[PDB]
Each structure stands twice: as structure tokens, then as C-alpha cells.
Design a protein around this ligand. Structure first.
Ligand SMILES: Cc1cc2c(cc1C)N(C[C@H](O)[C@H](O)[C@H](O)COP(=O)(O)OP(=O)(O)OC[C@H]1O[C@@H](n3cnc4c(N)ncnc43)[C@H](O)[C@@H]1O)c1[nH]c(=O)[nH]c(=O)c1N2
Length: 450
């Protein structure tokens, strides 16, 4: 006789542009905001990324409490928890954002069956991508386009992505009182210590929808920078103020709506007729993401499109002996984010013909440490790898940073090396090494390859 609904967060960790949340609140006597956390994640995942998620859930908790509700972090597996709470809470509707990843399809199909057995309606809107990816494939005749230029042609044919959804109401229907499965002590957001991590996170990027919107506003503080953006011309050695938006972790977890980002770019583009165009523009960057999601989700053998241990270990542990390479690998572990062309440098130095190895092994290392780790974006970018015309990937940074400021920041052992040798410290006169307190082979390794 009443509507009791669940809004289930997996991605889409936001209140803004959340059509699943708007549906669950409509005409609802009680709404249960749920995140399902697998407590036994022990089995691979850096504390930096997991803490980013926890911070994002803490932000959601604060947002829901401001509106008379709270987030319920349920422990267990969705297939076991949901049948119990469907009956306990008298649920009539279950809402959640659509997800096209492989595991998500298996998980969501099972939950859809359990909902039907309990008489629960399921509503799953598209809001993680700009477009309904299935719709794009259908309008392309039933096959995903295979080049960026062709893909940009198709979306231009389709038109603008949908507008961001309205903000939710200032007050929300709360969960019912004294429901055993909603008890606060069993449903709070845990800390990185409580989930089992021993080392603290070191990244400088904080999770959550609130920080995402703050960072988006900062990127749009200069419309001329947004209008003139060209990805290949940005500086990979810029760390104090990165040369790109660093919105990737926020888009990965859904703290930031891709649709809101796109709408804001078109606002700026209307007033700047000479703005950059795809693929180098900031809109092009969003379209790279959409392109790889579309191809990845509709391609069965997606990982097969691109056709010894010691070299990988040195690369993994930032001891290759090339300061530019080791500095980036240090940024990976410490920040979990590096500029696109820094990612290119270490990836080419690993796969494009310096250490050979297999690109899959390099992806595994990225998958552990990147805070923007994305099943589709990580793999696709490794394969699309297969710029250094003058500067080889091992001294690439010298073009932008002849003094080696980036290297000195992340490899402080080299902080007193004269700039003439900071990219090739093995060339320094051996008394220069002594003076700088950095002897090659003692304080910093010699190059691992001739
Ligand atoms: C080896 C390797 C591995 C990865 C990636 C590249 C390479 C070469 N990338 C892509 C890229 O390096 C990354 O998206 C940016 O460095 C993120 O920086 P900004 O958010 O400042 O991007 P910037 O502000 O330039 O772009 C804005 C947004 O567009 C998207 N975007 C930009 N460049 C992209 C690209 N090349 N491919 C797809 N989407 C792109 C992202 O959503 C990004 O947040 C990736 N990206 C990611 O989100 N998760 C990942 O796990 C990886 N892994």
C-alpha cells in the first residue's frame, strides 16, 4: 500500500545528475540509500584508491544527513543481503545506475531475478556515460565504430548528450525506524584502518562529490584555458599545478557527472568560437572515455585486440636508473595519478621496445595503484599505445623541465645533482656525484639497460 524504495550506489557516488535517486524518492514513504561493501576484500588494491572510495562515501553520508536521511553501508554480498532487506523493509522499488562492466552485468542480472521473486520493481537509468552506449551501437548499424574520428562522427550525428538531471529535493524520505538491518553500528562508513590496511594513503587528491565540483569550478575559472585546451601540448612535468584537470578519479567513481562536465564545456564553447575541437580539446577527452567504454562494453574479446621478470620488477619498484622514468613510477605509487604523457613515457619504456615484456603486466601494476583505475580506460590505452622524435621516453621530461624540478620532487636523492646531469646522472663527473651526495650504484642505481 506504500512505496518503500532502495537507491543502491555502486558508481554514481553523487547527488547531482542522479536519475536513479530521483526515481526512488518520487512518492516514496521510505527511501533506503545503500552501498554494499564486501568486508572480505582480502584475496591487489592500493590504500590510495580504497581510501578515495571511503572518502567518497563519507561525503555522501554528509549530504544525506543534511537532507534528513543517512547512507546505509551494508556488509556482505548483494545477492545475499538484498532478499533479506526486501522483506524486512517491505520494499517495492529498487533503483540503481546502469553499469556496463563485465562483472556488473552478472551481478545485476542476479539481483534483478531476486527483485522479481519479491515483487520489487527495478529501474536502471543510464548516467555513468554521456550516452546510452547500446543506442549508439544500434545507430551505427549494430557495430561500435573502431576509430576516434568515426566515433566523433557518430556522436555528432546523434546530437548532444542528455542534460544533467535536476538536483534532488532538500528533504528526503528517511529509512524506517528500528529496522534491524539499518542499525547504525552495522551500517557506518569504515576507515582505511578498519578495512585492514596497514600503510596510510599518501595521495593529495581527496574523494567525494564535493571535492569533484570544487575541482570542476577551478578548471572553469579561466574560460580561455578551457576553450584553447589541447591535450598534446600540456606539460607532463607540472606537479605543483598539474597541466590537466585531474578529474579522472572523480569521473571513474561517479563523484562527477560526465553529463554535467559536457554541458559546462558547451557553455564555454558557445562564447569562444575559436575553441579547440576534438580529439585534442577537453570535450575530446570526454569523448576518448566514451569511445573506449562503447568499444569495450560491446566487444567480446576486448583484451585480445593487441595480439624477463627482472625488467618488470625494476620498472615496478622505480629503480630503472632513468630519473624521469623512476620519478613517474614514484608518482604512480604515491599519488595514484600521473599526467597522460607521463603514463605514455613509462608505458612505452616498458612495452614499445625498451624492456619489451607484455603490456598486460604493465596494466596490472596500473590497476593496483591508479586512483582513476577504470577497467575500460586502462586496458584500451595500453593497446592503443602500439612523440619521442627528438627526446626518447627516457629523457622526455628534459624538453619541458631542463632543471629537473619534477625529478627532484619525487626522487629527493637527486635534489642536489646539477641540472646538466639530472636526467643522465651516470654521466656526471664522479666528483660531482660525491659533492651531490648521489653516487651512481650506491645511492641511485645505474641504468638497467645499455
Ligand atoms: C597506459 C595508460 C593508462 C591509462 C590511461 C592512459 C594511458 C596511456 N588513462 C588515460 C589518461 O592518461 C587519463 O584519463 C588522464 O591522465 C587523466 O588526467 P585528467 O583527469 O587531468 O585528464 P584531462 O583533464 O586531460 O581529461 C579529462 C577527462 O577525460 C577523460 N580522458 C582524458 N584522457 C583520456 C584518455 N586518454 N582515455 C580515456 N579517457 C580520457 C578522463 O575521464 C579525464 O578525467 C586512464 N584514464 C582513466 O580515466 N583511467 C585509467 O585507468 C587510465 N589508464
Amino acid at each position: 500500500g506504500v512505496k518503500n524504495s532502495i537507491i543502491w550506489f555502486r558508481k554514481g557516488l553523487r547527488l547531482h545528475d542522479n536519475p536513479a535517486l530521483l526515481e526512488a524518492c518520487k512518492d516514496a514513504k521510505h527511501v533506503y540509500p545503500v552501498f554494499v561493501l564486501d568486508p572480505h576484500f582480502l584475496q591487489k588494491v592500493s590504500v590510495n584508491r580504497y581510501n578515495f572510495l571511503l572518502e567518497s562515501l563519507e561525503d555522501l553520508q554528509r549530504s544525506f544527513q543534511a537532507r534528513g536521511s543517512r547512507l546505509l553501508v551494508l556488509r556482505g554480498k548483494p545477492e545475499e543481503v538484498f532478499p533479506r532487506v526486501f522483506r524486512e523493509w517491505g520494499v517495492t522499488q529498487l533503483c540503481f545506475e546502469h553499469d556496463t562492466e563485465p562483472y556488473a552485468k552478472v551481478r545485476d542480472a542476479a539481483v534483478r531475478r531476486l527483485a522479481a521473486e519479491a515483487g520489487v520493481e527495478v529501474v536502471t537509468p543510464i548516467s555513468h556515460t554521456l550516452y546510452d552506449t547500446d543506442m549508439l551501437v544500434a545507430r551505427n548499424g549494430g557495430a561500435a565504430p573502431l576509430t576516434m574520428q568515426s566515433f566523433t562522427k557518430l556522436v555528432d550525428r546523434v546530437g548532444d548528450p542528455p542534460a544533467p538531471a535536476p538536483d534532488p529535493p532538500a528533504a528526503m524520505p528517511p529509512p524506517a525506524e528500528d529496522m534491524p538491518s539499518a542499525a547504525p553500528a552495522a551500517t557506518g562508513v569504515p576507515t582505511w584502518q578498519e578495512v585492514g590496511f596497514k600503510e596510510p594513503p599518501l595521495t593529495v587528491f581527496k574523494g567525494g562529490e564535493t571535492e569533484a565540483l570544487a575541482r570542476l569550478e577551478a578548471a572553469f575559472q579561466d574560460p580561455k584555458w578551457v576553450a584553447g585546451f589541447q591535450k598534446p601540448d600540456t606539460d607532463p612535468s607540472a606537479w605543483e599545478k598539474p597541466a590537466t584537470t585531474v578529474l579522472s578519479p572523480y569521473l571513474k567513481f561517479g563523484c562527477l557527472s560526465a553529463r554535467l562536465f559536457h554541458a559546462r564545456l558547451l557553455e564555454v564553447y558557445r562564447r569562444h568560437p575559436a575553441h579547440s575541437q576534438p580529439p585534442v580539446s577537453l570535450r575530446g577527452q570526454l569523448l576518448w572515455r566514451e569511445f573506449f567504454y562503447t568499444v569495450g562494453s560491446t566487444t567480446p574479446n576486448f583484451h585480445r585486440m593487441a595480439g624477463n621478470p627482472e625488467f618488470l620488477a625494476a620498472w615496478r619498484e622505480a629503480r630503472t636508473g632513468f630519473p624521469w622514468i623512476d620519478a613517474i613510477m614514484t608518482q604512480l605509487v604515491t599519488w595514484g595519478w600521473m599526467h597522460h604523457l607521463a603514463r605514455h613515457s613509462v608505458a612505452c619504456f616498458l612495452t614499445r621496445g625498451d624492456l619489451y615484456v607484455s603490456w598486460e603486466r604493465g596494466m596490472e601494476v596500473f590497476e593496483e595503484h591508479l586512483i582513476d583505475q577504470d577497467h575500460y580506460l586502462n586496458a584500451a590505452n595500453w593497446m592503443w599505445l602500439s612523440y619521442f622524435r627528438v627526446y626518447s621516453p627516457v629523457v622526455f621530461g628534459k624538453k619541458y623541465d631542463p632543471e629537473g624540478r619534477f625529478i627532484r620532487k619525487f626522487l629527493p636523492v637527486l635534489k642536489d645533482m646539477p641540472a646538466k646531469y639530472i636526467y643522465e646522472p651516470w654521466t656526471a663527473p664522479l666528483e660531482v656525484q660525491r659533492k651531490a651526495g648521489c653516487v651512481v650504484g650506491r645511492d641511485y642505481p645505474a641504468p638497467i639497460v645499455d
